[PDB]
Amino acid sequence: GTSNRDWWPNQLDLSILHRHSSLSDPMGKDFNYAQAFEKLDLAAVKRDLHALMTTSQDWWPADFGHYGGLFIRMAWHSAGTYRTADGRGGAGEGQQRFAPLNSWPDNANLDKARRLLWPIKQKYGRAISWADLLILTGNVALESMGFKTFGFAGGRADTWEPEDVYWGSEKIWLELSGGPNSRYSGDRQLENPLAAVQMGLIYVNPEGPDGNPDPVAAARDIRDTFARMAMNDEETVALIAGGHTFGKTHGAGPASNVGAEPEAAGIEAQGLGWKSAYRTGKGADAITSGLEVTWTTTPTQWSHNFFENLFGYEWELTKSPAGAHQWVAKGADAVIPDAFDPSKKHRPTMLTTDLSLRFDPAYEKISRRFHENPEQFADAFARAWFKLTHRDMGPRARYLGPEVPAEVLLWQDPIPAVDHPLIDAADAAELKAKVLASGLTVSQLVSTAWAAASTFRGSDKRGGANGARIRLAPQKDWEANQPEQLAAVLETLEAIRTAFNGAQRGGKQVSLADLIVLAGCAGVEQAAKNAGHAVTVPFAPGRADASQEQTDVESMAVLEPVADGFRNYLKGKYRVPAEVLLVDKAQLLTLSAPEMTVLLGGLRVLGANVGQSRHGVFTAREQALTNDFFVNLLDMGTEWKPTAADADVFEGRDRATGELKWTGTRVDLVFGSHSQLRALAEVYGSADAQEKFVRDFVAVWNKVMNLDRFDLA
Amino acid sequence: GTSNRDWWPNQLDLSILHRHSSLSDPMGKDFNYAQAFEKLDLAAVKRDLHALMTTSQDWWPADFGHYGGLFIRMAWHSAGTYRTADGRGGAGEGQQRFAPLNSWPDNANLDKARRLLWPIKQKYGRAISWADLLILTGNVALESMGFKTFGFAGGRADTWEPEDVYWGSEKIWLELSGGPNSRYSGDRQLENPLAAVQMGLIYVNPEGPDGNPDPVAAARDIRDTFARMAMNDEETVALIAGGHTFGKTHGAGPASNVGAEPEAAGIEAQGLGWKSAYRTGKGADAITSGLEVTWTTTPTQWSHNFFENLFGYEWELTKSPAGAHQWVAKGADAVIPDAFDPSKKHRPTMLTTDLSLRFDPAYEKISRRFHENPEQFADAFARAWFKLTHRDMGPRARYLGPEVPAEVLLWQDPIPAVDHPLIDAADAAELKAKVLASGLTVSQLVSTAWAAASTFRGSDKRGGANGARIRLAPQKDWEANQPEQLAAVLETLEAIRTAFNGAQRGGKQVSLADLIVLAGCAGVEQAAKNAGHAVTVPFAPGRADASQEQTDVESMAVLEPVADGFRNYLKGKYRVPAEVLLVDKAQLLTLSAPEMTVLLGGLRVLGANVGQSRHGVFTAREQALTNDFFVNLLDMGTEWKPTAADADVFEGRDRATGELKWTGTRVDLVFGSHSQLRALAEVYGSADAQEKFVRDFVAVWNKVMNLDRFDLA
Ligand code: HEM
Ligand code: HEM
Ligand code: NA
Ligand code: NA
């Protein structure tokens, strides 16, 4: 059946802004997962998971009689899709059970692991999400095998359809680098926002780069991809050595034995995939990755035998039964148990990527230190496993249940607790008037509050106006934030704050985070007043001001809005058209297409553009909240042409006279070109729409202001 | 960006069930189009449309100084996508302004017609939908040119994204028959549900079949496509001759001059397309279809000149300036005006498809009669234009405004008005108890009410339980409805009805249509009671019984559910897999994926399957309303395999012993296979979900019982 995507494959795709609607959700509109989780008997779920670890099912017999290894890998791949660049991927939505992740080659036989969990998911129902359960099961695996975890937070609500993520452009699973859709260019530079070396892998190729079994080269890919998943060298070594203390790989016969991945398998497979014709197709005969490595002499118990083996032997390049490159310990005795036959034993083996931990010079120091101090290894692995499995959950306010660790970690972008009375509605009105009386403009007020609140991304729930991080490095120096203007606005607001706070009793005070948002609300109010409307913009206090020492500058860097269509901003030239980057930012902001549309049209006429650019400012009453963007954009009396100097800027001229009326970017003009966006523009550009436009703009403004307010959830 | 659709292009697409969500809608949740339309000053809109007809814009100058032809074609293409097979297409949702239809080749330069209407749409705003406006404009064009229309109804609400319609499988616009994705096989057999001869055409090729200019062969395509749009010979002849009384075609130079269609054009084109490098690109130089035909001596006035020209000359094959086949009158004088130059005149011309009206024997007789009796032509065209433009609007209760014709027409599937007091809640309770005391089973009651209500399709709003059409030909004879069993149930219900109606006073009576639905409700109550739940099923009286004479047997044929997954029914073997046909039926029923899921699971255990087939009846307490379907389907203790005898039936065996536990179809097993459906099945198959299942089932049951109840809108 030929589709619009087939006819016009480069047209902008708005369906990404309309996923996760109430139509696709089987739970009531009123369902609150946090409330269901809060009543879960978490102890009883853990006792069940513990029993399951050693209760082998004959359809997928447990290696060594213990599923622990399998379930650790399951949870690490659930979490391991995360990219710091956009915050997409990770464990937080349980997307491993949907396409395409459920069928990535790196996720082979994780369908079996998930199916093993059905009885427990069925028993506890809506009270534990598949997303929380994947992670919990990993924790319980570790605990069952003698490793004490750092803690666990529930709260990851289930989703009900595939997330829209750019995972790369390749058309062939696992394609080696350098093809027509290469994710690499230059000196092995991985394109943002990717965080894996090949389509369908979690991070790196366990044989080595593009299959070349060079541990030193593999180390470079490990470091690059893990950094792109927000992990540093110490965390990376801890995670890899920690994980590969347990279990085994599977490659007992040729890969050509393995049938279709789950999304391609026949209906009778009932959601399972990779059915194998090799011998029994399971257990002793299992084929998953193609590698056949078992790392320790006790694969079902925590130990320090991974680093003892790594450093205590020299290693030889060999091949698994499926032909994969892997390494075996030279001259070793048969000390590694067999997963099914008590009478056989094997020499220690390793992946190329495991050898990277010894042969990269910077990893070798860390590995040596962990080998000498197994307690340091254990502590680092515990902390890294928590970060890995929680890095996409957002603020600590979202963390549920009795196992939440009390320690506040830098990567959580922590916000201090509020310890004073909050401002009330009269206070808010007084503050808005003082803000407006200072001389700050509508344009300044809206721009500042937009800049502060629009760092939020729903992908990992990082960013937003909470914390007043706009006043700190690095946000205060981002070009999009206009650092000099920003500093002068912040200084005026801080004088207002000081004056207000010094007049109070009873310890009532207002944070700068709250005042930034409130001041933006006053700007929008005044803009509405300038257009003849009396409205109150809602405002909820309770944000707090975070310190520079609570703000990791390097991890903040990924929030810099190098494209922000809502401010008509592009930091450089990108191979993705600007309208696609608009819709990308809108999705991160959790906006629908109507919300995106109203919001952009308003922000243009309020003066929010970076550098005071006139592009898209289609009004003669700047700083009044009107629908002039849409009415002027849609006027057929104007003809548009790309400029000679820059094909991405357009001149709008009177058709009759040739007089220059406006200029606009691709971001501006897409609203009068794309057939779905133009239909939305037409609603807000009709003669009956000025009141609707004001009310919808206020609503969407308030939504943006509150994106990170999980304290009010 | 590689997508799930790229990796698994044959996987079932559920996003069609979650289209048109509140996310993509710019209007409030509470927006009611009918109430906005009821306040429109329709007379004022029509005055404005009159003024527009001769207000030529320089960017697309009006032929003969009047746009009426162009706007009649616009309206007739809006309506002309309609297929009686599925009810999809037509004018009723305004889809001509969205992809793909805004860019079909047959819709070339209709982007100009639509843009000419923007100022009016803008002036009246939400009070007139684009959908209503396109049709009203057609009407105004006719009336402006001297033709009295039969009427007009408003009420077509605008939609906000593209409708999911199978338009064919070809990958090339306008592909001639016999390609790798041919919509034709056999003796020129068009595949259902298609109603056009080439991808991107409204009905037929104006040059003749696959471009071959044989008017007799063209006539066969005309009859077949128009029948597939619910029009007979008399209506077809009237419409074609009626339309081609006005205006002209456009083919002033080679088609190679014409640029990208709208969805392909550059952003500066602002939603327009087909920009032409031929001379001025417009007006006298316009290129649309490539044909250059002007049919009458007064193209901007109603006349009888079409049939006078058709019959008064003999015709010679020639070519337009773009090289298209067309016809010119032998020996004729230059009598046809030029659209721009008062000093030129042209010989009469015709399309191949116009000549069909003379050279096909059956059309010839009709055309002669219209020629001889012009008042009959006028009246038949007025009626057929009304049908064309309202055929997809549904019941008369949806028709809004002061121009709605009082005459009731057969194709509106009319329902008599209620002229007595309705039953109340006490009466309902009495009737339900009587239904249960008669001996009729859960299975019979649910199957009957399902059969009656599930004829509804939202595409054209035909079908549903209103009218008690299930007791009439042809529904009472459909194999899916089980004629024998149906007759025995209807006879029992009719005795109950007679007894109840005979006891009443004051003219109160219950229709059979109501009693069928009420009896279904009682069956669901009983089924719930069998499972140990106390449930009252909502019911709304007010349906009436239609007569056989109000029920066109031929037009009812298209509602026959040749695939109905909700009863595990397939009438024959089809090239489309049965799970695709399930989701298709759900979409017609307006169901989301969670609704479809709960509904099917319930219907299986209540005994709704055609022929009492055991396929999918995964319970040992048939006729009790439980979630057994889901709990047993998801049981990993069962292994499924296709049977040797039939690859579309599956056996589910105990994995440990090999004992057969169940059988199922592809419709049954898709819920355990498709990753998104199985996530839904899991919610209803959980230990906490028996009450949720029962309540969600009742809600969806009631929804289906009320689909056609536009009398209570
Ligand atoms: C350079 C990074 C990594 C690479 C290339 C890698 C590669 C692999 C491969 C290829 C397998 C075999 C799959 C099979 O055939 O069954 C596997 C197994 C495993 N990995 Fe990793 N791994 C990496 C990091 C991690 C991390 C970070 C963890 C967890 C903290 C982890 C935990 C495990 C576990 C537990 C298994 C055993 C599965 C079982 O017993 O069934 N790995 N790894
Ligand atoms: C077999 C059926 C039909 C064929 C193949 C057909 C074909 C066409 C073609 C090829 C054009 C020229 C498009 C262009 O170059 O501008 C056209 C024009 C038009 N058709 Fe049809 N037509 C059909 C039926 C209809 C019907 C049912 C109506 C309306 C009741 C209609 C009304 C018109 C009008 C008014 C125009 C003139 C447009 C103008 O002046 O710009 N036609 N037709
Ligand atoms: Na994420
Ligand atoms: Na339709």
Secondary structure of B490-531 in HEC code, one letter for each residue: HHHHHHHHHHHHHCCCCCCCCCHHHHHHHHHHHHHHHHHHHC
**Inter-chain residue contact B4 with A269, CB threshold 8 Å:** no
Q: Which of B17, B264, B674 sits opposite A8 (nearest CB)?
A: B264
CB B655 within 8 A of CB A58: yes
Torsions phi, psi for A390 (to 5 deg): -125, -5
Rounded to an integer, what distance in angstroms lies between the CA atom of residue B305 and that of residue B468? 47
Cross-strand bridge partners of residue A287: A251
CB B221 within 8 A of CB B197: yes
Cα of B109 from ligand 2 centre, angstroms: 13
- Is A420 labelled as part of a ligand binding site? no
Residues A15 and A35 in one domain: yes
Packing angle between helix B215-227 and helix B233-243, nearest 10 degrees? 110
Cα of A671 from ligand 3 centre, angstroms: 29
A293 lines ligand 1 (CB under 6 A): no
**Inter-chain residue contact B2 with A121, CB threshold 8 Å:** no
Rounded to an integer, what distance in angstroms lies between the CA atom of residue A431 and that of residue A512? 12
Provide the strand spans (E) within A484-624.
563-564, 569-570
Which residues make Cβ contacts (< 8 Å) with residue B623, sequence separation at least 6?
Answer: B441, B442, B443, B527, B530, B605, B606, B607
Query: Which amino acid is residue A616, in one-letter code?
Result: G
Query: Domain containing B395 — which CATH number?
Result: 1.10.520.10
Q: Is B77 helix (H, G, I), strand (E, B) or coil?
A: helix
CA of B677 to nearest chain A CA: how many angstroms apart? 9
DSSP code string of B420-467: SPPP-HHHHHHHHHHHHHTT--HHHHHHHHHHHHTT-BTTTTB-SSTB
CB B513 within 8 A of CB B466: yes
Which residues make Cβ contacts (< 8 Å) with residue A134, sequence separation at least 6?
Answer: A74, A75, A78, A91, A94, A96, A114, A117
Please name the helix (run of DSSP H) or strand (run of DSSP E) that holds residue A445, with its range, or none.
Answer: helix A442-453
CB B134 within 8 A of CB B128: no
Judging contacts by C-beta atoms under 8 Å, the chain B residues touching residue A199 are 2
Query: Domain containing A344 — which CATH number?
Result: 1.10.420.10
Cα of B337 from ligand 2 centre, angstroms: 18
Rounded to an integer, what distance in angstroms lies between the CA atom of residue B411 and that of residue B553? 11
**Inter-chain residue contact B636 with A11, CB threshold 8 Å:** no
The two structure tokens encoding residue B337:
């005006």
B73 lines ligand 2 (CB under 6 A): yes
Which residues make Cβ contacts (< 8 Å) with residue B687, sequence separation at least 6?
Answer: A122, A123, A124, A125
Intra-chain end-to-end CA distance of chain A, in Å = 43
Residues A677 and A694 in one domain: no
CB A609 within 8 A of CB A615: yes
The two structure tokens encoding residue A177:
């680098």
Residues B31 and B153 in one domain: yes
Domain count, chain B: 4
CB B618 within 8 A of CB B633: yes
The two structure tokens encoding residue B252:
């002033």
- Atom 18 in ligand 2: which residue has the minimum CA distance? B249
**Inter-chain residue contact B21 with A22, CB threshold 8 Å:** yes
CA of B398 to nearest chain A CA: how many angstroms apart? 23
Nearest Cα neighbor of A677 from A667, A662, A663, A689 is A667
CB A384 within 8 A of CB A242: yes
Residues A41 and A160 in one domain: yes
Cα of A78 from ligand 3 centre, angstroms: 11
CB B100 within 8 A of CB B162: yes
Residues A505 and A440 in one domain: yes
Rounded alpha-carbon distances, angstroms, from residue A281 to A70, A107, A358, A423: 16, 17, 35, 66
Judging contacts by C-beta atoms under 8 Å, the chain B residues touching residue A266 are 642
Q: Is B475 helix (H, G, I), strand (E, B) or coil?
A: helix
Residues A440 and A490 in one domain: yes
User: Between vectors from CA B381 to CA B376 and to CA B386, what angle results, nearest 5°?
Assistant: 130
Rounded to an integer, what distance in angstroms lies between the CA atom of residue B295 and that of residue B306? 6
Q: Which of A372, A387, A419 delimits the end of a domain?
A: A372
B299 lines ligand 2 (CB under 6 A): no
Residues B343 and B266 in one domain: yes
Rounded to an integer, what distance in angstroms lies between the CA atom of residue B158 and that of residue B94? 6
CB B239 within 8 A of CB B388: yes
Cross-strand bridge partners of residue A326: A318
Which residues make Cβ contacts (< 8 Å) with residue B560, sequence separation at least 6?
Answer: B474, B478, B480
Residues B97 and B219 in one domain: no
State the catalytic residues of A.
77
Cross-strand bridge partners of residue B663: B651
Determine the residue of chain B that is closest to A159 in CA distance: B679
Residue B272 structural domain: 168-372
Residues B581 and B608 in one domain: yes
Packing angle between helix A233-243 and helix A361-372, nearest 10 degrees? 60
Q: Choose from B158, B182, B268 for mutation: most chain A CBs within 10 A.
A: B268
Residues B437 and B292 in one domain: no
The two structure tokens encoding residue A479:
């070009």
Please name the helix (run of DSSP H) or strand (run of DSSP E) that holds residue B115, with its range, or none.
Answer: helix B110-116
**Inter-chain residue contact A688 with B125, CB threshold 8 Å:** yes
User: Between vectors from CA B328 to CA B324 and to CA B329, what angle results, nearest 5°?
Assistant: 170
Q: Is A577 helix (H, G, I), strand (E, B) or coil?
A: coil
Residues B545-570 as b or e (16 or more Cβ within 10 Å = b)? bbeeebbeeebbebbbbebbbbbbbb
Q: Is B539 helix (H, G, I), strand (E, B) or coil?
A: coil
Judging contacts by C-beta atoms under 8 Å, the chain B residues touching residue A672 are 270-271
- Atom 30 in ligand 2: which residue has the minimum CA distance? B243
Which residues make Cβ contacts (< 8 Å) with residue A484, sequence separation at least 6?
Answer: none
Rounded to an integer, what distance in angstroms lies between the CA atom of residue B195 and that of residue B184? 11
User: Between vectors from CA A229 to CA A227 and to CA A232, what angle results, nearest 5°?
Assistant: 40
Residues A549 and A523 in one domain: yes
Q: Which of B1, B97, B199 sits opposite A675 (nearest CB)?
A: B97
The two structure tokens encoding residue B186:
């056999």
CB A527 within 8 A of CB A606: yes
Rounded to an integer, what distance in angstroms lies between the CA atom of residue A414 and that of residue A423? 22
Residues B185 and B333 in one domain: yes
Nearest ligand for residue A164 CA = 3
Judging contacts by C-beta atoms under 8 Å, the chain A residues touching residue B59 are 636, 655
Rounded to an integer, what distance in angstroms lies between the CA atom of residue A406 and that of residue A254? 49
**Inter-chain residue contact B655 with A115, CB threshold 8 Å:** no
Give me the torsion for CA of B247, B249, B253, B255, rounded to 10°: 150
